Write a protein that binds this DNA or RNA. Sequence first.
RNA 1: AGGGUGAAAAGAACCCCCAUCGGGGAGUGAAAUAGAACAUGAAACCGUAAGCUCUCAAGCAGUGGGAGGGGGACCAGACCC
RNA 2: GGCCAGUGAGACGAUGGGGGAUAAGCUUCAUCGUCGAGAGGGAAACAGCCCGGAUCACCAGCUAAGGCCCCUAAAUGACCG
RNA 3: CGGUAGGGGAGCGUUCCGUGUUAGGGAGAAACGCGUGCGUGAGCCGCGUUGGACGAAGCGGAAGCGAGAAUGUCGGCUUGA
RNA 4: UCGGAGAGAGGCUCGGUGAAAUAGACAUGUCUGUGAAGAUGCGGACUACCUGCACCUGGACAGAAAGACCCUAUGAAGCUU
RNA 5: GCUGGGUAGCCAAGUGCGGAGCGGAUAACUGCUGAAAGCAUCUAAGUAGUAAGCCCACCCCAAGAUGAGUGCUCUCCUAU
RNA 6: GAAGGUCACGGCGAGACGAGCCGUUAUAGGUGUCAAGUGGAAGUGCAGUGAUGUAUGCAGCUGAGGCAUCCUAACAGACCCACAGACUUGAAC
Lengths: 219, 42, 196, 116
Amino acid sequence: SVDAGIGVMGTKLGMMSFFEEDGTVVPVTVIGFKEGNIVTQVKTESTDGYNAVQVGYERLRDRKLTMPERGHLNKAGVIPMRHLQEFRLVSVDDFTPSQKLLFEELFKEGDMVDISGTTIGKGFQGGIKRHNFKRGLMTHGSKSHRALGSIGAGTTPGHVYKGKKMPGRMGGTKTKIRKLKIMKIDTDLRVVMIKGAVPGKPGNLLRLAPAKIVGKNIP
Amino acid sequence: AVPKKRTSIYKKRIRKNIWKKKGYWAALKAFSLAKSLSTGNS
Amino acid sequence: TKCTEEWRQLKEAVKKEFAIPHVPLDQRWMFTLEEATGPDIWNTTWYPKSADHVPTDKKWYVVDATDLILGRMASTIAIHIRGKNLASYTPSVDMGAFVIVVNADKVAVSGKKRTQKLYRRHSGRPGGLKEETFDQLQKRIPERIIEHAVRGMLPKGRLGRYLFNHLKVYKGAEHPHQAQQPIDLPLRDKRIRVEK
Amino acid sequence: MKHGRKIHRLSRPADQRRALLRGLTTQLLKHGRIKTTRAKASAMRKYVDKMITLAKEGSLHKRRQALGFIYEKQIVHALFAEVPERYGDRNGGYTRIIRTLPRRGDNAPMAYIELV
RNA sequence: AGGGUGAAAAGAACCCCCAUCGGGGAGUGAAAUAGAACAUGAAACCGUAAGCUCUCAAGCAGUGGGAGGGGGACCAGACCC
RNA sequence: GGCCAGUGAGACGAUGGGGGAUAAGCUUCAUCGUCGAGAGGGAAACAGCCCGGAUCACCAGCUAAGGCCCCUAAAUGACCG
RNA sequence: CGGUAGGGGAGCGUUCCGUGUUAGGGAGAAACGCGUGCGUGAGCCGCGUUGGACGAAGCGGAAGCGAGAAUGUCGGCUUGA
RNA sequence: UCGGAGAGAGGCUCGGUGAAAUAGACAUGUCUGUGAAGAUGCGGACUACCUGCACCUGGACAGAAAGACCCUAUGAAGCUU
RNA sequence: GCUGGGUAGCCAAGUGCGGAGCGGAUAACUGCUGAAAGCAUCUAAGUAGUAAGCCCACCCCAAGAUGAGUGCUCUCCUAU
RNA sequence: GAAGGUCACGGCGAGACGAGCCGUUAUAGGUGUCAAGUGGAAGUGCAGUGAUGUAUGCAGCUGAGGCAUCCUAACAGACCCACAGACUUGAAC
């Protein structure tokens, strides 16, 4: 919950092979940005029950928004945007609304960033692919191949246990990949270069916020 | 494999009425198209 | 629609009024017989009419639970929620008052119960029984301790749920129900306050 | 699981899919308007448009390229002669999908495809 | 295995929907709430209409108590849902 | 003594024993209780334990066995340990 | 005046026969479906609708005489859908 | 090892036609206790809006065939000396 | 038809990332002060160390949490 | 016809169906082009009796990817919904 800095919204833009003057070949994700990461609302212990900052992203023609959202953004005096996401912090002040978040100035390279985002959707999938089950024999006359085998025990339990692993919808869900190196911040292009992989195909939103180690948070 | 008893009544009504509601939805959609048939469409 | 609605409502009012004038309905206080003299209230055991027991008219109570006995308090609370308090009692309906408890986290218990007593909830899974002590739970969520003690004494069933809601437990001393003017609760027991 | 895979199957194998698209393309070119299903129509826009595009650069090579397709010589000779006059202006998108009433004996959705 | 329109075929001219089937008016008849799938027409089963009534419930489904609501062109502390 | 039946698989508990391993909701006899064929109340539920033998009605009363913090009738009764 | 096997006593209905080609009945019988009558019960008794011609008592008689169970049996109609 | 990808026929959705074995009644939770000794139905708790569709088979001592093993019947039948 | 290549997608044998706390209460154990029992004694008052075990913390879900929470913002004209 | 919601219309890195999300004058397709794949087309010239080679030519054919451009289809339109919010107490201009 309580995040170790203010995060920043972002967009995935494929993978690059990034070299260095050693000759270490490094795999990297190009992360682009679209109008803003503008602060919208500030929540407090005073009125709202907790400390937090809401941050929009991605500009629109202001017909595609609804009256209520138009009001909520026009109260802050802000460009039309989707994707208001919160960041619950302990720190509260110096986040007054209509203030742009300089991704360039707020990270500073070699940081190890924690990126969330919704993953690739693999539909309704079987026990094997979903829960890393094994399959039965192929020959020696086995009419079982890919299946769950037995489910439960016998008359004693007399029913199927709750959260028994079964075929279901794998993918299309949020997963924080945490601790990831920032390789380069292109001043020119406004494009962050992060080591490794990141959830979803090119297009997805990403909640880009700093390392959340247990010497940083709340004992 | 096989059913233990019969559903008998009331439950079968509940089951059938949703199926008839599928029909209802189709009726709404077909009603909507009749107005589209009247005027324009180029 | 409008015409027929207004006209229908004008008939609904009149027919409502025609019956309201057919036999009338007291409150309590009263005297045995009156100028009703309809069906026999006197040789047929009393049973409450909804006109009597409405939820606004219900009494209130406050218990300060500091340095008390958990079980002994809870029994009286249960009684005053049921309505065995009142002469006009009925098992089928709730005609009992509400209760508000404050300083639930300072409630006391005898013996070595602060460590040894376990509160168990079982998630409903092949593993998950989760068992924590009296004091360990009190540090986290003290409300339950009173609440759980009370619900165990109320009659489990459709009524048991409804008249459970009437309990209002709280962590601290102050409570937000000043509007209702909840009076102090009477307490049958000698052992009820702790020795100190 | 069909992620970023774009191909109109038409319920068939590759035997018969190309056989369908070919024949439909021929008949459409011949008559100029045809009635078929929505899927059989909507899939057909890659091949009609490809062949009209092929009829822009009327050369020995491109006529054989097209003539492997149509399986009817005398339609493909109608193109090359016809096309560059009556499509010289138009830059892609030579095909319109009008859409009309389900087929009786299977509630199959239905459409018209014809040259624009 | 598979009988019972009517006393009498008087078995429905004509009109409407309409390619047929069948249907509604007309006409016949004591009756067509006797129309050829026709006489009396029980139950299961399938609906349509009205009165009340279920979405924090746990139930061999009733039973004793009975909140609130509804009546029957017949003014009941009575009676019914 | 006449006419005319069912029964002839029993079960548990107390005691006296046998068999068993003084194991068995084991088995076999002897004396008695209950079930069987017996509702009701006590025993959470619980044929066989305790109380008590259901002709039927009463929105009367007294009690047996057993109980009197709340779920759930009756003392959050008393005095001494 | 609890009651299984089981025995004994007292009854109700069903169709048909004597009485009787009775009265009662096309100003509505048998049936069929409803009753804020009756009885300890099996059952009885009045009702106006549907129905369209049969046929109560009482005193007697005789049986193809009473159904929920037979993996009964014939017919109908469900469920799974 | 240790799976992965793809093509067809199904599966899924829409329109048309349309079965089955099964079925005391089903308003058909989990835990532990109880009981003809292995309970959706009995006791105490816990959990739980109402209702589809897709998938899965642990239970309903699921369905199927009055056990074909075992033993009984002063049953049947083959075969042997 | 049979081979030889293969972009996207999907895949791993390929690439990244993960398991971290001087946070809490404990279990065996080790103690401090300290009587009953002038002494002793980890305990009867009190208190300190002290485990992959237990609870917070990490990560995903989550107010159908009928106990249905909280915040910001929009809308309440008529046959329409 | 409020706010909004649901349909329809073009789709999707979302999806069994519903759901989700984007689009409805840069959403899909087409066209143009460019990464990329494959490997040097057809036609013609020349060489060889001929199988064949060879030049024109990193060609030709693809292009599920990116980017550009309204050429085509996003036309036509439908359905649902509003009393400023029962009832009681107590602080407050």
